Amino acid sequence: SKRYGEKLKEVFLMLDNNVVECIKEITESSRNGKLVFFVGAGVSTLSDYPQWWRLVDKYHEELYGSPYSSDEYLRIPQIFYNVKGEMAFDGILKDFFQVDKPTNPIHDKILAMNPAHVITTNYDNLIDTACWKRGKYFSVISAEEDVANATSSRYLLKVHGDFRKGFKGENVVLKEDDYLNYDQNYPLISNLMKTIIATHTIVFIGYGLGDYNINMLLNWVRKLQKDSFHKPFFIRTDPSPIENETLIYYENKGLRIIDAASLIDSNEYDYLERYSAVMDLLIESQENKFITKDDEVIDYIYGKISPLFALQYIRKIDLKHVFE
Amino acid sequence: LDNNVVECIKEITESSRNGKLVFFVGAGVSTLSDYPQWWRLVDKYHEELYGSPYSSDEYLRIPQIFYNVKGEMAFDGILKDFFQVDKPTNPIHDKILAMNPAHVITTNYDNLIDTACWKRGKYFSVISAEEDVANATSSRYLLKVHGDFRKGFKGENVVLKEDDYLNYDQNYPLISNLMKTIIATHTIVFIGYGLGDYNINMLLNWVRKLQKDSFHKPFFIRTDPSPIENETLIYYENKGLRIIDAASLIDSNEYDYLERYSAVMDLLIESQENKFITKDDEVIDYIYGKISPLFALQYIRKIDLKHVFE
Amino acid sequence: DNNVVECIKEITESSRNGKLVFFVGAGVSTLSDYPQWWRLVDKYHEELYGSPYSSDEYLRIPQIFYNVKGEMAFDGILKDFFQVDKPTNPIHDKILAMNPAHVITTNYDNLIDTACWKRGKYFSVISAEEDVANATSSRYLLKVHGDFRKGFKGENVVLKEDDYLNYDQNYPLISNLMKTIIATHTIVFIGYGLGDYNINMLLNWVRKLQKDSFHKPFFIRTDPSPIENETLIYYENKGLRIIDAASLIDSNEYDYLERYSAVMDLLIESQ
Amino acid sequence: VVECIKEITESSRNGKLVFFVGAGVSTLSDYPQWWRLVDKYHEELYGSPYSSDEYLRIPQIFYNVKGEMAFDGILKDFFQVDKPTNPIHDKILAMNPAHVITTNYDNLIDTACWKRGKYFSVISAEEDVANATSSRYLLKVHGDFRKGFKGENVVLKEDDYLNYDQNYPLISNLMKTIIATHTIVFIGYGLGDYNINMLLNWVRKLQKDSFHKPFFIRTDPSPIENETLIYYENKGLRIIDAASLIDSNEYDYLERYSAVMDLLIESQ
Ligand SMILES: NC(=O)c1ccc[n+]([C@@H]2O[C@H](COP(=O)([O-])OP(=O)(O)OC[C@H]3O[C@@H](n4cnc5c(N)ncnc54)[C@H](O)[C@@H]3O)[C@@H](O)[C@H]2O)c1
Ligand SMILES: NC(=O)c1ccc[n+]([C@@H]2O[C@H](COP(=O)([O-])OP(=O)(O)OC[C@H]3O[C@@H](n4cnc5c(N)ncnc54)[C@H](O)[C@@H]3O)[C@@H](O)[C@H]2O)c1
Ligand SMILES: NC(=O)c1ccc[n+]([C@@H]2O[C@H](COP(=O)([O-])OP(=O)(O)OC[C@H]3O[C@@H](n4cnc5c(N)ncnc54)[C@H](O)[C@@H]3O)[C@@H](O)[C@H]2O)c1
Ligand SMILES: NC(=O)c1ccc[n+]([C@@H]2O[C@H](COP(=O)([O-])OP(=O)(O)OC[C@H]3O[C@@H](n4cnc5c(N)ncnc54)[C@H](O)[C@@H]3O)[C@@H](O)[C@H]2O)c1
C-alpha cells in the first residue's frame, strides 16, 4: 500500500502538463458536482461480466457451427434473431447475462468521484449496486418510460437498456436493428444523454477509441457549434500506449485523452492496473495526496478560504465544513 | 369549475410543490405587457417591400423576403428600431414566477421574463444561445429557445425568418435538445400560445414520435376570447395536450386578455395551498396519503406529527 | 423584354431536344370546373363547426375532420365532392401538344389521364408505390399526391396534414422519381402559386442541391395582378424562372383561362 | 437459379436490367482492392499494417493528420495505372444493360463500353446529372478521377460516406430511381459489403412488393452458408452463388465470375 502510494505520487510528479491539467479539470468538476461518468464495457469486464465477443461467438456457433469485426458485432446477433427466432436469442441472453458479479474497485472509485450522473451502455446492474451501497440514490433510467418518472436529480442512464424488466432482447440494444432504430426507439433516452453530455463534464472510462458508441457520440458532437461544448475526457486503458497519430486525430475530434498505458507500465493483460492508475490519480488529486510544496499548500488554503472574505466573521464550527 | 379543470389545477400545483413545473411562455404573455406583436414587424416588412399591408407561412416568408432583398443590415435595423423599447413586467410574469417553476422556456426575444426574474429575486441561468448551455451557472434554466437580443439587437441572434425555423434543429442543437429534455422530464404549462401556433404544433409533431405513454401531456393555458370548439378541443387533447380554457373559465369581453390570463393564473396560485377536499372521502384520502408512509415505522412521536401535516 | 423571350426560347429548345417535363398544379385542373382545394377545406370546416384558409389550415382542417369525424366520413365527403365527369380544358390539350417528356401532377383527378388517353399521347400513370416498380411505359404521368383510381378514399391521396407529414416515409419511390425527373428534365410549373406549399417544398429541396447543378424550373404565374418586383427577384433567386401572365397580357380578375391559354400558346408558337 | 436467370434474361431482352458493378470486378483486372490502399494508408501513419469502420477511418485519419496533399498524392500514385478490361466486363455488357451502376472510381467500365460499341452517359459528379445527354446511364456513385486524382472527387474516407447524401443528392436520387424502375443484378460485391447493406437498409423502407428483388451474384470461394443466404434473401436479395454453382479454386475468382455471367448469357 505504502509502496503503491509512493509510486502514484512519483507518477503524478513526473506526469505531463496536459495530463495534470486534465486531472485538475476533472477534480474541479467533481468538486462542483458537474462531473458525469460515461462507463463502457471495460468497467463491466473488470468484474468478469460476460464480454460481447463471447455472446457474438456463441451466436455464430449456433448460426454456422464454428466459433469478429465491429460490423459483425451487430450483424451476427441480427442474423441469429432473423434466421432463428427471438426465443433462442432471448434464451442465450438469459443464460449468459443471468449472473451475479461483484462491483470491482473501479466502480467504487467512479462513485467516489461524486459524479452528477453515470451514463452507461452496460446492461448489467453493477453500477446500480455500487451506488446503492454508497448510500447515494441514483434514479435508474433504462427504458423510455423511466425518463418521465425520474425520482431524483442524479441519473443512472443506461442508454442501451438493461434486463430489469427481464432478460429479453427487446429490453436492450444489441443487434443491428436496435442500433439502426435507436433514435426512433429511444428518443427520450438519447435526448437525455445528449443533454447530460452538453451540460456536464463527461469522462469516458471503459471504452475503446474506435468503439461504435464513441464514434456516434463524436459524430453528433461534430454538429455542435464550435466551442459550444466542453471536450469530454476519455480514459484510455488499452494495453499498449496510444499512437501519436491516433491521439492527435481523436483529440481534434473532440476528446481529451488520458492514456493509462502512457502513465504506468503494466502487463498486456493487466487492465485493472491501468484503470486503477487513472482512477487513483484522480481520487488522490481529489484527496490532497499530491500537494507537497508550500506553494500548493497556500493555493489550496486560499481556494478554500477566499470566498469567506466576503463575510465579516466565520464561526469556528463552520471552519470545519469549510475544510471538509 | 369542471372536474377536468380541477384535475389539471391539482396536477399543476403538485408539480409546482415538487419543483417539477416548467412554464412554456409564448408571445401572448409578452404582448400582455404591450410588447410589439410579431404581426406588427411582418406588416412593417410588407409595407417596406410593397406599397402597403398575415398567414402562418407569411409570418416566416415576409421577413425572409425582406432579408434576401433589402439586406441583413435593413432587416436588423427594422428589428432594432421596433424592439429596442423598454416595457414593464406584467402581473402575469410575477404570477408565473410565484408558481415556482423549475424552468421557464420561452419563445420570446424580450427580457420581460428576465426582468421579472431579476425583480422577483429569482436566479435563473439565461440560455439564449448555443454557448450558454455549457456555461449555465445554475441548475434552473430560463431557456429562450428562439434566442434574444442580449448580445445585440441583430437578426442573427433570434429566430424570426423562415430560414431560421428551417435550420433551427441544425443551428440550435444544444438548445433544442435541452428544451426537449426539459419537456420530457418536467410538467409543462403553455401560456401565451395559440393552439394553432407554429411552435406548439412543431412540439406536438415531435411528441407524436414518442412512446405511447412515455411522456406527460403538457398543460395548455388557452386564453383566446371565445371558448374552444368541442371539435378543436377533441383534436388537440388527443394530440397530447390538456387544455385549460380561460374563456370557459370566466365570462369576459373580446379584447380584455389580461383578465383572461389573470383568471387562470390566480385560480392556479390560490389553489397552491388548497387541499381541494370537500367531501369526507377526499379528506380521508388526503389523510391516508399523509399517514400511509408512516405505517412502516413501529411508532411515531406525536410531536413529530406536526411536520407530517406541515 | 429580353428575359421573357429568352426563357421562352429555353423552353422551346427543351421541347425540341425532348427534355421537357410539365409539373401541373391546381390552377390547370380548376380551369375545367374542378373543385379548388379550399372549397373542400371549407366543406370540412362547415361539417366540423358549421361556418367558414392559411397554408396550415389547409392541412389541419381536413386532419381535424379525419381525426374526429372519422375516415369513413372523410372518404364520403371526398367521393361526393370529387366523383364527377369533368371536361378536359384546352390547357390539357396545349400541354399535351407541347410533347412533354413526363407529366408530374399534384392533382389527384383523372383530367390529364383522360386528356392523354383521348389525345393519343400515352403515359404510364404512376400514382402509388406499386406503379413505380411495374410501369410498362418509360414516360411517366406522375401523380405525386396520388389519385382515386383504386377508390375515392383519402388513403390513396395526399390531403391531410399527416399525409404531408409522412409523405417521404409513405411515398419514397414517388418522391425519388419526382426529384430525379426534376433533375434530369426541364420543369414547367403550371397551375401553382408562388406561395404554394408544394412549390416551396420543392424550392427547399432545390436549396440543398449543389450550386448551379440544375436547370431552374419554369414557373407559369397565371395570377390576376402583376408580380411585385421584390417577390419576383426573391423567387427567381430560389431557382425559379417565372413567366407571368399578368405582365404578358392584360385581362381582368376572372380571365384565368385566358392567362393559361396565352402563356401556353405563345410558348407553343415560339417553338 | 433457373427463375433468376429467366428474370435476368427477360430484363435484358426488354431492356429493364441494370448491373451493380462492385470493387470485385475491377480487382479482377488487378485494380488494387480497397483494403490494399487502406493498408497503404495505415503504413504511413503507424508504420506497419479490416472492418468497415477501419476501412473508412484509416483514410480519414491520414487525411486529417497528414493532410489533403498527402492523401491526393497517395491516390495519384495508387490509381495512375492502366488495366485491361476483364472478360467479365464484356460479359456484363453483353446483356445490353439499361444502366450500369458501379462504386468503382476507375475508368475500366467506360473503356469497356467504348470498345464494345455501347454508349452510356457516364455520371460521376453532381453537375454531370443535368448535362447527361442520354437515357442510358453509367452511374459512378462514388465519384471518379476524370477531373483528376483528387481526394475531393471520390468517396473513399469516413467523411465522404457520412456526408454522401448531403454532397451527392442528385446521384443518390438517380441511383435509387434506377434501382426502383429496373431489375438490379449485383456483381463483384461483398455480401456483407457496406454499400450493399446501406442499399438493403434503404430498401427495407419501401413497401413490400413495390420493388423487384435485386439479384446478388456471390462469387466467394466457399458456398454461401444457408443461414446467411436465408437472412440476405429475407432482406430482399435473391442470391445466386457461383461457389455452389460450380466447384472452383480458392484464388480463382474469374472462373466463378465467368460461370455466373455465361450461365446468364447462354440462358438468353
Ligand atoms: N475481434 C474481437 O473483437 C474479439 C472477439 C473475441 C474476443 N476478443 C478479445 O477480447 C478481449 C477484450 O475484449 P474486447 O475484445 O471487446 O476489447 P476491445 O478492444 O474490443 O475493447 C477495448 C476497451 O475495453 C476495455 N477492455 C478490453 N478488454 C478488457 C478486459 N479483458 N478486461 C477489462 N477491460 C477490458 C479496455 O479498457 C478498452 O478501453 C480482447 O483481448 C480481444 O482480443 C476480441
Ligand atoms: N395578421 C395578424 O395576425 C394581425 C395583425 C394585426 C392585428 N391582428 C389582431 O390583433 C390581435 C393580435 O393577436 P394575434 O392574432 O397574433 O393572436 P394569436 O392568435 O396569433 O396569438 C394567440 C395567443 O396570443 C394571445 N393574445 C392574442 N392577442 C393578444 C393581445 N392583444 N394581448 C395579449 N395577448 C394576446 C392569446 O392569449 C393567445 O393565446 C389578434 O386579435 C389579431 O386578430 C392580427
Ligand atoms: N384560398 C382561399 O381561401 C380563397 C379565399 C378567397 C378567394 N379565393 C379564390 O382563390 C382564387 C385564387 O387565389 P389563390 O391563388 O389563393 O387560390 P388557390 O389557392 O386556388 O390558388 C390556385 C392557383 O391556381 C390558379 N388559379 C386560381 N384560381 C383559378 C381558377 N378559378 N381557375 C384556374 N386557375 C386558377 C392561380 O395560379 C392560383 O394561384 C380566386 O379565384 C379567389 O376567388 C380563395
Ligand atoms: N474481420 C475481418 O473483416 C477480416 C479478418 C481477416 C481477413 N479479412 C479479409 O480477407 C480478405 C480476402 O479477400 P475477401 O474475399 O474478404 O474480399 P472482400 O471481402 O473484399 O470481398 C470483395 C468481393 O470481391 C470479390 N473478390 C474478392 N477477392 C477477389 C479477387 N482476388 N479477385 C476478384 N474478385 C475478388 C469477392 O468475391 C467479393 O465479392 C481481405 O480483403 C481481408 O479484408 C477480413
For A256-285, give the DSSP string.
Answer: EEEEHHHHS---TT-HHHHHHHHHHHHHHH
Judging contacts by C-beta atoms under 8 Å, the chain C residues touching residue D211 are 133, 173
Resolution (angstroms) equals: 2.8
- As a whole number of angstroms, the longest Cα–Cα distance in chain C is 54
CA–CA dist A138, A123 (Å, integer) = 16
B202 touches chain C (CB under 8 A): no
Judging contacts by C-beta atoms under 8 Å, the chain A residues touching residue B184 are 147-148, 188, 191-192
CA distance between the termini of chain B: 27
Neighbours of C145 (CB within 10 A): 19
C209 touches chain D (CB under 8 A): yes
The minimum CA-CA distance between A192 and chain D, rounded to whole Å, is: 24
Which are the contacts of B130, defined by CB distance < 8 A and separation ≥ 6?
A: A224, A225, A228, B171, B172, B173, B174, B175
The minimum CA-CA distance between D231 and chain A, rounded to whole Å, is: 6
Residue D15 has φ and ψ, to the nearest 5°, of 100, 15
D residues 113-172 lying closer than 8 A (beta carbon) to A? 162
Helices (H), B213-256: 230-237, 246-249
Parallel/antiparallel/unpaired status of strands A117-120 and A35-39: parallel
Instruction: Give the type of residue at C132.
Output: V
The minimum CA-CA distance between D131 and chain C, rounded to whole Å, is: 8
Pocket (CB within 6 angstroms of ligand 4): A 69; D 24, 27-28, 33, 35, 50-51, 188-190, 219-220, 253
- Rounded to the nearest angstrom, the distance between the alpha carbon of B57 and the centre of ligand 2 is 16
- As a whole number of angstroms, the longest Cα–Cα distance in chain A is 78
Q: Is B146 a catalytic residue?
A: yes
Give the chain B residue whose CA is nearest to the CA of C53: B55
CA–CA dist A54, A59 (Å, integer) = 9
CB–CB contacts below 8 A, A to B: 65
Q: What is the CA radius of gyration of chain B?
A: 22
Parallel/antiparallel/unpaired status of strands B125-127 and B21-25: unpaired
Parallel/antiparallel/unpaired status of strands C241-244 and C218-221: parallel
| A208 grid coordinates | 475503446
What 3-state class would DSSP assign to B189?
Answer: strand
How was this one solved?
cryo-EM
What sign has the CA pseudo-torsion C243, C249, C255, C260? negative
CA–CA dist C15, B130 (Å, integer) = 50
Judging contacts by C-beta atoms under 8 Å, the chain B residues touching residue A195 are 177-178, 181
- Which of B30, B45, B216 has its CA nearest to residue B116? B30
**Residue of A148, A188, A224 lying closest to B174 (CB–CB):** A224
Which are the contacts of C59, defined by CB distance < 8 A and separation ≥ 6?
A: C159, C160, C161, C164, C197
| B64 grid coordinates | 425572409
Q: What stretch of H or E contains A117? A: strand A117-120
**Helix A187-199 vs helix A212-223: crossing angle, to nearest 10:** 70
Around C80, how many Cα atoms within 13 Å sit in the side-chain half-sphere? 7
Residues D211 and D180: beta-carbon distance below 8 Å: yes
- Which residue puts its alpha carbon closest to atom 33 of ligand 2? B32
Neighbours of C97 (CB within 10 A): 14
CA–CA dist C32, C30 (Å, integer) = 5
Q: Is D105 a catalytic residue?
A: yes
B65 touches chain C (CB under 8 A): yes
Which one of the listed residues C34, C66, C108, C235 is annotated catalytic?
C108
**E strands within chain B?**
21-25, 103-106, 125-127, 141-144, 187-191, 219-222, 242-245
Q: Which residue has the cell 472478360?
A: D87
Q: Is D209 a catalytic residue?
A: no
Residues D119 and D136: beta-carbon distance below 8 Å: yes
